Amino acid sequence: EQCGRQAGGKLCPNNLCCSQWGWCGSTDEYCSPDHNCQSNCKD
């Protein structure tokens, strides 16, 4: 994994959102609170 609780609490590079599953991206499945985004989230 890349970030979040699945990767030692790491933040994503380049201000990307960390999804609920520990992967870095920029779309709703990664960034939305409705999808349990972990960090660098949108709204």
Count the domains in the chain: 1
Least Cα distance to 29 among 40, 18, 39, 14 occurs for 18
Least Cα distance to 22 among 42, 43, 8 occurs for 8
Please answer whether residues 40 and 27 qualify as being in contact, where contact means their C-beta atoms are separated by less than 8 angstroms: no
Question: In angstroms, what CA-CA distances link 33 with 5, 25?
Answer: 16, 14
Sign of the dihedral defined by the CA atoms of residues 36, 34, 28, 41, in that order: negative
Report how far residue 28's alpha carbon sits from residue 20's, in angstroms, rounded to the nearest whole number: 11
E strand segments, the chain: 17-18, 24-25
Q: How was this structure determined?
A: X-ray
> Where residue 1 sits, what CATH number does that domain have?
3.30.60.10
- In the chain, the amino acid numbered 37 is C
Report how far residue 34's alpha carbon sits from residue 27's, in angstroms, rounded to the nearest whole number: 12
Q: In units of Å, what resolution does this entry have?
A: 1.5
Q: How far apart are the first and last CA of the chain?
A: 23
* Residue range of the domain that includes 11: 1-43
